[PDB]
Amino acid sequence: ENSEMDQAKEKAKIAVSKYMSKVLDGVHSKIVDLFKELEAIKQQTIFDIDNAKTEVEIDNLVHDAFSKMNATVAKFQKGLET
Amino acid sequence: NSEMDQAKEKAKIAVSKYMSKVLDGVHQNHSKIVDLFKELEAIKQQTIFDIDNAKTEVEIDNLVHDAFSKMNATVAKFQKGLETN
Lengths: 82, 85
Known about the structure:
2 copies of one chain form a homodimer.
Chain A: H1 5-24, H2 31-49, H3 55-78
Helix pairs in contact in A: 1-2, 1-3, 2-3
Protein name (chain B): C protein beta antigen
PDB class: protein binding
Keywords: Cell-surface Protein, Immune Evasion, Complement, Factor H, protein binding
């Protein structure tokens, strides 16, 4: 009844997982807290995608997760300063 | 001395390589992904400059990590820009 919109949800969920890997690579300790925080954002974004009703809510949810994940890595980096 | 010289060389390369690393997986009528690339290129040159002027090896580290932190914040601002309404 509602394919295509179910593919969009499925690709967005995967993209959120795939991005979390990417933002971990090149990052090299409060890093375990970095893991946990990113995980929290990913879980919360995939839960909200599962409830999205349009393609713009889905896309907004993805790019917001992307934004939050880069931000979290920014605080982490700033925090390795002395 | 020549170990400060080598510490400076290696920091510049970490800043240069990371600028590729941050852009990976970032993909999405038209995006400001060209201004994000000019913005990242700006943070890099500023930082490569500041490394040369750095006094100690603890300052070199603060510089590298501060640059890492700026590039993720820039990418973060770029992603937020991609939302709508």
